[PDB]
Design a binder for this molecule. Structure first.
Ligand SMILES: O=P(O)(O)OC[C@H]1O[C@H](O)[C@H](O)[C@@H](O)[C@@H]1O
Ligand code: BEF
Ligand SMILES: [Mg+2]
Ligand code: NA
Length: 221
C-alpha cells in the first residue's frame, strides 16, 4: 500500500492560472511587450516564476540586467499576492477536501510538491494547512519540473521513498517529474496534456482514496 500522496497545487488542489495571467499581462503591458494573451498563458502553466518571466521577455526580443529581471519578477509577484488575498475554501477543487480527509484518517502522508512559492499561503486561504504533513520548498530545489527533485523532496519531507508514493499532477512536466522520482503518477485532464503509460482521470472528482488504492494495486508486480 502507498505511504504518501504528493500533491501538485495548481490544477489539482485549486486553479491559480487566472490570477497569474492577469498579473503577467499587467507586467507585460507595463514594460511594453505584446503577446501575453490567453493562448500564450497556456505555455506558462506549471512553469516557475523565473522561467515564465524569461518566456515573456522572449516575446521580445528583450534583454535586461540580472537585477532588472529580479525586480520585474518581484513586481508581478507583489500584484499576484494582492489578488490571491480572497482565495477561500470554496476554491478547493471537487473531491480534494474529502480525499485529504480520507488520506489523513488512514494515516497516509500528505505533501505538497508545487512550483509555487506562494503554496503555504494558498493552503492557508483554503483552510488546508492542517492536512499537509510537509511542503516541499521550490526555492530549495531546482531543477524545476520535469526534474524529479521537488517530488523527491516532498516524499523525503514526510519520511517516505518516492517508490512508496503516488503523485497527482495536471502537467506534462509534472507527470515526467513524478515518473523520474520513482513515484506513481495519476494525471488529471486530457492525455495529450499529461503523458503516456499512466492512469488519467478527467477531473479531480475521480481522485478518491478507493480509486488511488485500486490504481496502486494495478501498478504493483
Ligand atoms: O510565482 P509562484 O506563485 O512562485 O508560482 C510558480 C508557478 O506555480 C504553478 O506551477 C503555476 O502553474 C505557474 O503558473 C506558476 O508560475
Ligand atoms: F502547483 Be503546481 F506546480 F502546478
Ligand atoms: Mg499544476
Ligand atoms: Na471566491
Amino acid at each position: 500500500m502507498f505511504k504518501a500522496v504528493l500533491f501538485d497545487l495548481d490544477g489539482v488542489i485549486t486553479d491559480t492560472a487566472e490570477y497569474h495571467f492577469r498579473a503577467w499581462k499587467a507586467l507585460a503591458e507595463e514594460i511594453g511587450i505584446n503577446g501575453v494573451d490567453r493562448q500564450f498563458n497556456e505555455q506558462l502553466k506549471g512553469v516557475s516564476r523565473e522561467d515564465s518571466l524569461q518566456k515573456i521577455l522572449d516575446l521580445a526580443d528583450k534583454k535586461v540586467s540580472a537585477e532588472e529581471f529580479k525586480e520585474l519578477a518581484k513586481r508581478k509577484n507583489d500584484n499576484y499576492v494582492k489578488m490571491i488575498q480572497d482565495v477561500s475554501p470554496a476554491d478547493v477543487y471537487p473531491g480534494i477536501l474529502q480525499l485529504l480527509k480520507d488520506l489523513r484518517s488512514n494515516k497516509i502522508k500528505i505533501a505538497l510538491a508545487s512550483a509555487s512559492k506562494n503554496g503555504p499561503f494558498l493552503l492557508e486561504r483554503m483552510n488546508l494547512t492542517g492536512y499537509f504533513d510537509a511542503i516541499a520548498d521550490p526555492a530549495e530545489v531546482a531543477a524545476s519540473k520535469p526534474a524529479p527533485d521537488i517530488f523527491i523532496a516532498a516524499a523525503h519531507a514526510v519520511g517516505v521513498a518516492p517508490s512508496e508514493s503516488i503523485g497527482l499532477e495536471d502537467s506534462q512536466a509534472g507527470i515526467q517529474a513524478i515518473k523520474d522520482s520513482g513515484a506513481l503518477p495519476i494525471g488529471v485532464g486530457r492525455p495529450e496534456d499529461l503523458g503516456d503509460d499512466i492512469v488519467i482521470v478527467p477531473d479531480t472528482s475521480h481522485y478518491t482514496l478507493e480509486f488511488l488504492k485500486e490504481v496502486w494495486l494495478q501498478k504493483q508486480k
